[PDB]
Design a protein around this ligand. Structure first.
Ligand SMILES: [Zn+2]
Ligand SMILES: [Zn+2]
Lengths: 49, 215, 110, 49, 48, 146, 83, 49
């Protein structure tokens, strides 16, 4: 569902950017939204986020 | 959004319907017009204006049927309750069991949401003439007795068990045992020594009856 | 991040030190690269496969309904291509899928 | 008379070691049942064992 | 005869419901099938 | 991160849409989440089954486990056309679902189904079973065949 | 004691194969221990065939105790069983 | 190579099912006098006959 995953360092911050396209969701008719992907990322145990 | 709200509402509605069927199957008095509650009426009555599900307005009491209290010597009223918290603590479980003891109910059903800690599991047996049963919501989305692979179970009273034992001339320990905490046994709420008659349907032989004893 | 050192050809570890700024420090030799101003990034391009269509041509020679499109910043169309499809259980309302005539952006209702 | 006689003599005789007969009747076809490739109703990759 | 689970008789209006099945039921089933087969033969005569 | 699950069930490896001979469509998945599959909306929760027997047990009770055992053994036997009478299969299913749980036919299952010391000693784990019987002082009634 | 009377018998009146085998075995052993025979042998010198001839017209004096699995036996004379 | 596994399975089955018998009250019981089935197969018919 992601075009890419990348890691960006700011001047004093570090984060990971994920680009989710709504085109693949609409073409597959998955009942998935961006905040759903966010809360699904929160439900990962090994990442400990 | 619709995904976070309507699916949760539908799951809660189907869980409510399954709990209603479960309470009716135990012999308690529930009319057919309550168990066939459609989605629209449930959203109108048991749901908030902004679509949020409230569960403190969902708990209800159930009384025995005249036929059930005729066949079964003693049978009281249940108070089935749905907890609002997603992860129940020891405090709310203690509050629930205190409520059940105070209102003088013979049994109680505590439908939790996600998970219950063992520190709250250890406190459900605390009341001598009353019992507490816990059911997960995902364990209540689909009724298991309506499944094809599960044939009809029918509990038997103490006189019924005694008649069966006299007819087959055998002691209680010789019947094929069934564990409690089995899903069908949990559906029927079977105590130790209670005998359930099963009506199996095989293609070769037709309908034939077997028997089982809890624990 | 797969940056390699220009002195000893080793892996660059980004550290904050104690002042709070991230630097491309190298622990094998004295060398780092502060990231002030322009920012650095490493993108891993995930594969893009051709997955199976589900609504490919699901609105051909179909009736058109009169529904307001949610996107009013692009098109003012009021005629939408709709299709009735049973998606949930038999005891629930029949959902439908319908789209704008101009800007696409398909949406469904239950 | 023939049907009733057949049914009445077709009842299982008491004392029969029916468990032994059943165990053998399940076990011995395993000798003759050679390995053969199987698929579940028109799809090739399901490779049921 | 079909006794209930209580050791009493069963009224002859609700015998076929699925809560009073006894050990003899298959035997009863056999007899019904037997009669049904003879019925077919009788039908095969009558239409002729 | 790109290996995280965002929509679906963790144990379902893959799903294939199949057509039956009458033209109706069914869904075959390869996983262990029986309850999650049969509780999702759109799938009939009364006619969903699986070939695995422990999932059938833990979801739908010991009687459904027995039915699953009988159906699976009969299907495997009839696939090769060996023509085994189903009564033996029913007997085997009643044996494995005797003590309330699917105990199976192994050294860890006979030790639970049967309390005879000598038979369990003669089958497997002679020394351990004999010494445990000596320690626990369990009387053995000579009623079996072994 | 625990004997079911001669009218409340609720076991099949047919004589099973195992009962036949045991009856013939016991009768052949008794004949081989020089017991009298109630059938006119025609030169047969094997106890088992003489026992078979005795069974053929129901002359064996043995009876069968069908122990029900609760401690209550059930008498059946060999001459009464159908076979 | 099928013979070893098939014989092991047959031995396990026969050790498990050696004690069953059909008592004179038409109930299949174990050696310890516990009922497995109330009637053999639901109708008490030997597959032999
Ligand atoms: Zn360096
Ligand atoms: Zn538009």
């Amino acid at each position: 569902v992601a075009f890419y995953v990348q890691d960006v360092y700011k001047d004093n911050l570090s984060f990971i950017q994920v680009r989710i396209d709504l085109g693949t969701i609409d073409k597959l008719q998955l009942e998935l939204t961006i905040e759903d992907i966010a809360v699904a990322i929160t439900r990962a145990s090994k990442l400990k986020i | 959004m619709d995904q976070e709200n309507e699916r949760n509402i539908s799951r809660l509605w189907r869980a409510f319907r399954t709990v209603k069927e479960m309470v009716k199957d135990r012999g308690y008095f529930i009319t057919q017009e309550e168990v066939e509650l459609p989605l629209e009426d449930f959203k109108a009555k048991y749901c908030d204006s902004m679509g949020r599900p409230q569960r403190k307005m969902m708990s209800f009491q159930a009384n025995p049927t005249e036929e059930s209290i005729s066949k079964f010597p003693d049978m009281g009223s249940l108070w089935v309750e749905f907890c609002d918290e997603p992860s129940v603590g020891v405090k709310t479980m203690k509050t629930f069991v205190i409520h059940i003891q105070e209102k003088n109910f013979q049994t109680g059903i505590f439908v939790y949401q996600n998970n219950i800690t063992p520190s709250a599991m250890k406190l459900v047996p605390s009341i001598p003439p009353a019992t507490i049963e816990t059911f997960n919501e995902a364990a209540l989305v689909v009724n298991i007795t309506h499944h094809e692979l599960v044939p009809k179970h029918i509990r038997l009273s103490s006189d019924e068990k005694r008649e069966l034992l006299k007819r087959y001339r055998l002691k209680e320990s010789q019947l094929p045992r069934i564990q409690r905490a089995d899903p069908v046994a949990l559906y029927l709420g079977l105590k130790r020594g209670e005998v359930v008659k099963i009506i199996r349907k095989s293609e070769t032989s037709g309908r034939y009856a077997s028997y089982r004893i809890c624990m | 991040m797969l940056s390699f050192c220009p002195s000893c050809n080793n892996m660059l570890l980004i550290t904050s030190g104690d002042s709070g700024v991230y630097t491309l420090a190298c622990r094998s030799c004295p060398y780092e690269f502060p990231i002030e101003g322009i920012e650095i990034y490493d993108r891993k391009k995930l594969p893009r496969k051709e997955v199976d269509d589900v609504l490919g041509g699901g609105w051909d020679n179909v009736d058109q309904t009169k529904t307001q499109c949610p996107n009013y910043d692009t098109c003012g169309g009021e005629s939408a291509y709709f299709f009735q499809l049973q998606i949930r259980s038999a005891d629930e309302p029949m959902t439908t899928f319908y789209k704008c005539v101009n800007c696409g952006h398909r949406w469904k209702e239950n | 008379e023939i049907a009733l006689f057949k049914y009445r003599k077709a009842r299982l005789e008491p004392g029969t070691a029916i468990g032994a007969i059943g165990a053998q009747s399940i076990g011995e076809p395993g000798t003759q049942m050679t390995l053969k490739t199987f698929h579940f109703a028109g799809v090739a990759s399901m490779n049921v064992t | 005869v079909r006794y209930d689970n209580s050791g009493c008789l069963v009224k002859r209006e609700d015998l076929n419901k699925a809560e009073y099945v006894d050990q003899y039921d298959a035997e009863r089933d056999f007899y019904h099938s037997l009669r049904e087969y003879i019925n077919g033969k009788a039908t095969a005569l009558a239409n002729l | 991160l790109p290996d995280v699950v965002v929509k679906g069930l963790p144990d379902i490896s893959r799903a294939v849409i199949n057509i039956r001979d009458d033209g109706k469509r069914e869904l075959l998945v390869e996983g262990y989440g029986l309850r999650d599959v049969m509780c999702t909306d759109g799938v009939i929760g009364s006619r969903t089954t699986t070939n695995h027997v422990l999932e059938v047990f833990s979801v739908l009770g010991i009687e459904a486990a027995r039915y699953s055992i009988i159906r699976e053994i009969n299907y495997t036997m009839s696939n090769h056309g060996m023509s085994v009478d189903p009564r033996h299969i029913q007997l085997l299913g009643d044996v494995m679902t005797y003590k309330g749980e699917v105990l199976g036919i192994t050294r860890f299952g006979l030790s639970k189904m049967r309390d005879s010391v000598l038979q369990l000693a003669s089958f497997e784990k002679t020394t351990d079973h004999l010494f445990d019987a000596a320690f626990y002082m369990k009387k053995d009634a000579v009623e079996g065949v072994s | 004691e625990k004997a079911i009377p001669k009218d409340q018998r609720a076991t099949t009146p047919y004589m099973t194969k195992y009962e036949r085998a045991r009856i013939l075995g016991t009768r052949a052993l008794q004949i081989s221990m020089n017991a009298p025979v109630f059938v006119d042998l025609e030169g047969e010198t094997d106890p088992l065939r003489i026992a078979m001839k005795e069974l053929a017209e129901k002359k064996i004096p043995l009876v069968i105790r069908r122990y029900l699995p609760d401690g209550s036996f059930e008498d059946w004379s060999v001459e009464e069983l159908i076979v | 190579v099928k013979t070893a596994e098939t014989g092991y399975m047959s031995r396990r089955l026969m050790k498990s099912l050696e004690d069953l018998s059909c008592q004179y009250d038409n109930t299949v019981r174990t050696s310890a006098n516990g009922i497995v089935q109330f009637t053999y197969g639901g109708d008490g018919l030997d597959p032999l006959e």
